[PDB]
């Protein structure tokens, strides 16, 4: 199956990275956001932006910019796809205490999910007579928190889930992609995903298995990860899963590149992007019925 161009997704990641770090409040962030909006529109999506001024953990006032792209916005049966598009300002997990004040590319952490969903949006824009509405949401200000302070992360998704772009917004299911591009990635059952959306997690992991991606989508418990999907679950009641590279066997749970200078384009593996994208596209295809 090649409904999902791995080369194209890779290129989308590289473009994001070549803007420079998409750090909230900086010029590369603004330019990359403009480009994301324009690209989604070029793929036939109706795109709107949700802006707000939000207070970070350190009092910094961030210009949150969520990006919402919709196909068939009038349809009542909807599918939701999510990723965060900001970059963490500092790679304060670098295994070199000197780099805890510098910037990293966020190729996997932010770039990968956005790239996969941009390629999926291209695919969808080529479809005529979609069977369901589809919303692609790029959350801002996901990666600006402090460790141990759970509420300081996922600010864009908190805001959107508490203030959706349409009153009573509902989708049948939600899929969040987070760090879905690194070589050797392992996608285990994230706890909140399986606890609140067991049917969706089963369907997606079995879809991946059927496609030959059981080496990436492992049918075993992973971590309990408070990601952008949890506010959506809690405040909108949408069953959401999180496809995220994480393993308790990793020193940090997340890949060793996470929040280091090594989260750059050299960590990206086209085959991982392809596994995730082919899986998600096949699931969508079998849901628009």
Q: How far apart are CA 189 and CA 220, in angstroms?
A: 6
Establish whether 140 is an annotated binding residue. no
- Give me Rg for the CA atoms of the chain: 17
Q: What is the DSSP string of 190-247?
A: -HHHHHH-HHHHHHHHHHHHHTT-TTTEEEEE------THHHHHHHH---EEEEE-B-
Q: Using CB distances below 5 to 8 A depending on partner kind, what does residue 4 bind out of ligand DMD, Mg ion, Zn ion, none? A: Mg ion
Measuring CA to CA, which residue among 282, 245, 248, 240 is closest to residue 263? 245
**Known binder of ligand: residue 143?**
yes
Residue located via tokens 């496809």: 243
Closest CA to 111 of 159, 143, 69: 143
Q: Is 229 annotated as a binding residue?
A: no
Pair of tokens at residue 108: 């996997």
Q: What is the three-class DSSP state of 70?
A: strand
Shortest approach of ligand DMD to residue 153 CB, angstroms? 5
Report 4-43 residues binding Mg ion (CB under 5 A): 4
- Please state the length of the chain: 289
Ligand-binding site membership of 278 (annotated):
yes
Say whether 53 counts as a known binding-site residue.
Answer: no
**Of the two residues 10 and 85, which places its CB atom closer to Mg ion in the complex?**
10
Is 109 a binding residue for ligand DMD by CB under 6 A? The answer is: yes
Binding mask 115-154 for ligand DMD (x = CB under 6 A): ----------------------------x---------x-
**138 known member of a binding site:** no
Listed residue (228, 200, 186) closest to 82, CA to CA: 228
Task: Output 94 or 178, the one with its CB closest to ligand DMD.
Answer: 178
At its nearest, how many Å lie between Mg ion and the CB of residue 277? 6
Size of the site for ligand DMD (CB under 6 A): 7
The single-letter DSSP state of residue 150 is G
How far apart are CB 102 and Mg ion at their closest, in Å? 35
Q: Which stretch binds ligand DMD (CB under 6 A): 6-14, 36-44, 93-101, 222-230?
A: 222-230
Residue 286 annotated as part of some ligand binding site: no
Provide CB contacts within 8 A for 118, sequence distance 6+: 9, 12, 36, 39, 40, 43
Kind and range of the H or E run holding 168 = none
153 binding partner (options Mg ion, Zn ion, ligand DMD, none; Cβ < 5 to 8 Å by kind):
ligand DMD
Q: Footprint of Zn ion on this chain (CB under 5 A)?
A: 88, 109, 143
Q: Which helix (DSSP H) or strand (DSSP E) does residue 159 occupy?
A: helix 155-162
261 binds ligand DMD (CB under 6 A): no
Residue closer to Mg ion (CB basis): 2 or 149: 2
Q: 56 or 175: whose CB is closer to Mg ion?
A: 175
Enumerate the β-bridge partners of residue 67: 49, 138
- SS3 (DSSP) at 84: strand
User: Judged by CB under 5 A, does residue 119 bind Mg ion?
Assistant: no
Nearer to ligand DMD among residue 105 and residue 178 (C-beta): 178
Given the rule CB under 6 A, which residues bind ligand DMD?
109, 143, 153, 178, 225-227
Which residues contact Mg ion by CB under 5 A? 2, 4, 274
Extract the annotated binding site for Zn(2+).
109, 143, 259
């Amino acid at each position: 199956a090649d409904l999902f161009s791995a080369d194209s997704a890779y290129t989308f990641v590289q473009r994001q990275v070549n803007f420079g770090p998409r750090i909230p409040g900086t010029a590369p962030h603004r330019a990359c956001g403009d480009w994301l909006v324009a690209t989604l529109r070029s793929f036939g999506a109706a795109v709107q932006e949700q802006t707000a001024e939000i207070k970070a953990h350190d009092g910094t006032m961030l210009p949150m910019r969520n990006i919402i792209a919709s196909y068939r916005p009038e349809a009542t049966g909807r599918m939701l796809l999510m990723a965060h598009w900001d970059t963490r300002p500092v790679c304060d997990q670098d295994a070199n205490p000197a780099m805890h004040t510098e910037t990293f590319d966020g190729a996997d952490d932010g770039g990968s999910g956005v790239g996969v969903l941009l390629e999926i949006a291209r695919y969808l824009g080529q479809q005529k007579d979609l069977g369901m509405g589809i919303d692609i949401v790029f959350f801002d200000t996901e990666d600006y928190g402090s460790y141990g302070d759970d509420e300081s992360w996922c600010l864009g998704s908190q805001y959107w889930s508490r203030n959706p772009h349409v009153a009573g917004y509902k989708a049948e299911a939600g899929i969040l992609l987070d760090m879905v591009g690194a070589k050797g990635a392992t996608f285990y059952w994230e706890y909140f995903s399986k606890s609140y959306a067991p049917g969706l997690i089963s369907a997606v992991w079995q879809t991946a298995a059927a496609l030959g991606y059981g080496n990436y989508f492992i049918q075993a418990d992973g971590g309990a990860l408070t990601d952008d999907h949890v506010p959506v679950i809690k405040n909108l009641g949408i069953p959401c899963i999180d496809i995220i590279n994480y393993s308790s066997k990793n020193e940090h749970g997340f890949g060793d590149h996470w929040h280091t200078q090594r989260d750059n384009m050299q960590i990206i593996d086209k085959n991982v992007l392809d596994a995730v994208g082919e899986t998600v596209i096949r699931y969508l295809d079998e849901q628009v019925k």
